[PDB]
Design a protein around this ligand. Structure first.
Ligand SMILES: [Zn+2]
Length: 235
């Protein structure tokens, strides 16, 4: 559990990344994979599961490989009926069986068991997010989930998705914010955060970024606290 908060000279600065924040934008703007009661159909490497998940929308994929931190986590979820929710990328994505193209996408984590994970009533405790702009708490909004034990990733995607649209969190060129991290605070005081900005240099490696989600970290939707901490660029 508990991991400190960000050190100043540690956080990523958008002015140090120089290769289309749009490429970072693609991952959170109305972009994700959602599966309702799927069981692993196959596996490429020891730590991943391949689900036969079709593109409910415009069919860009029929196979989703999601990687987990290791084989012990993969063991635990293979055989299980699961609801899936993550962010995908095609870029540097896999090579399954050699025995069967149009419809191969990748993910990290995003697995939740279907049995006992939904509320008796609708989208419950639909989680509140406190946003901080230059230390000040300026806006607060609610994202909603339907699972009692949801992945940190799901709340992250929905959080950023809102931030992109109403706060222009990410532009296609660069970003109005220099730094930013999303901090999750659990009922027990467990604290853990993710950096929202890309590593320095031109290009952005999507798979290396999303990789932080492979631990398959879940939280409780009734009790989790989320605060995102941004900072503006000067002019
Ligand atoms: Zn379900």
């Amino acid at each position: 559990e508990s991991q400190p908060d960000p050190t100043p000279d540690e956080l990523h600065k958008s002015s140090e990344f120089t290769g289309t924040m749009g490429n970072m934008k693609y991952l959170y703007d109305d972009h994700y994979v959602s599966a309702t009661k799927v069981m692993s159909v196959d596996k490429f490497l020891a730590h991943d599961l391949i689900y036969n998940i079709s593109d409910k929308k415009l069919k860009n994929y029929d196979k989703v490989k999601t990687e987990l931190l290791n084989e012990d986590l993969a063991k635990k979820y293979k055989d299980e009926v699961v609801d899936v929710y993550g962010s995908n990328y095609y870029v540097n994505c896999y090579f399954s069986s050699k025995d069967n193209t149009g419809g191969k996408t990748c993910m990290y984590g995003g697995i939740t068991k279907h049995e006992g994970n939904h509320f008796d009533n609708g989208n419950l405790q639909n989680v509140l997010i406190r946003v901080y702009e230059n230390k000040r708490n300026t806006i607060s909004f609610e994202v909603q989930t339907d699972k009692k034990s949801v992945t940190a990733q799901e709340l992250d995607i929905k959080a950023r998705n809102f931030l992109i649209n109403k706060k222009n969190l990410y532009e296609f060129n660069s970003s109005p914010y220099e730094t930013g991290y999303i901090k999750f605070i659990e009922n027990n005081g467990n604290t853990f955060w993710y950096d929202m900005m890309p590593a320095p240099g031109d290009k952005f490696d999507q798979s290396k970024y999303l990789m932080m989600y492979n631990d398959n970290k879940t939280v409780d939707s009734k009790s989790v606290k989320i605060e995102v901490h941004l900072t503006t660029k000067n002019g």
